[PDB]
Design a protein around this ligand. Structure first.
Ligand SMILES: Nc1ncnc2c1ncn2[C@@H]1O[C@H](CSCC[C@H](N)C(=O)O)[C@@H](O)[C@H]1O
Length: 178
């Protein structure tokens, strides 16, 4: 299939490894596998990044997904996203940001926190983004939906919005119902 990739850079910031138990690391690994499989099947796949790759996640990936070094159309880097992407290009996605995302800028790099929180580290990614001086925004969930979404849910919404250009349709397709 002749696939037209989106210029949008989508980074899973894996610098929170030490804040998760091995059980939550395995859950993050499972969510990353879902992001990879959905990106490879997307109409307009993003430039997928896995930054700060190390610790428990790297060892769990070395043990179960031995072929992660062979993985195609993914940037798996041990460096922090700050070391690889320009400060002005970054937008950290976080539910605690007061900024409401209206449109996606395909020239920017959007960051998703590689964290299975369980509502324990409330406002952590928003605090780290504000301290570093980088831009931050929340998904326009409004009245459709804790508004905290899983790593793969945020990633899949970005892919669905690049296809539909309708936020309401993107949340409806990806988010699980009660
Ligand atoms: N409503 C929302 N809008 C934007 N990004 C969101 C979101 N809900 C979750 N995310 C993203 O999904 C990631 C995993 S959820 C972890 C939440 C954690 N308490 C935090 O401080 O972010 C988050 O780090 C964030 O990047």
């Amino acid at each position: 299939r002749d696939v037209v990739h989106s210029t949008l850079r989508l980074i899973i910031d894996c610098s929170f490894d030490h804040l998760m138990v091995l059980k939550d690391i395995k859950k993050l690994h499972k969510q990353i596998q879902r992001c990879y499989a959905e990106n490879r099947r997307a109409l307009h796949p993003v430039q997928f990044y896995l930054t700060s790759h190390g610790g428990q996640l790297k060892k769990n990936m070395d043990e179960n997904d031995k072929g992660w070094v062979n993985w195609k159309d993914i940037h798996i880097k041990p460096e922090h996203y700050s070391e690889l992407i320009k400060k002005e290009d970054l937008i950290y996605l976080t539910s605690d940001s007061p900024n409401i995302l209206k449109e996606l800028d395909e020239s920017k790099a959007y960051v998703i926190g590689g964290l299975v929180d369980h509502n324990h580290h409330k406002g952590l990614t928003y605090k780290q983004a504000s301290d570093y001086g980088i831009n931050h925004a929340q998904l326009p969930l409004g009245n459709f939906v804790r508004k905290v979404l899983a790593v793969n849910h945020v990633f899949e919404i970005i892919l669905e919005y690049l296809e539909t250009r309708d936020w309401q349709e993107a949340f409806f397709t990806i988010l699980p119902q009660r």
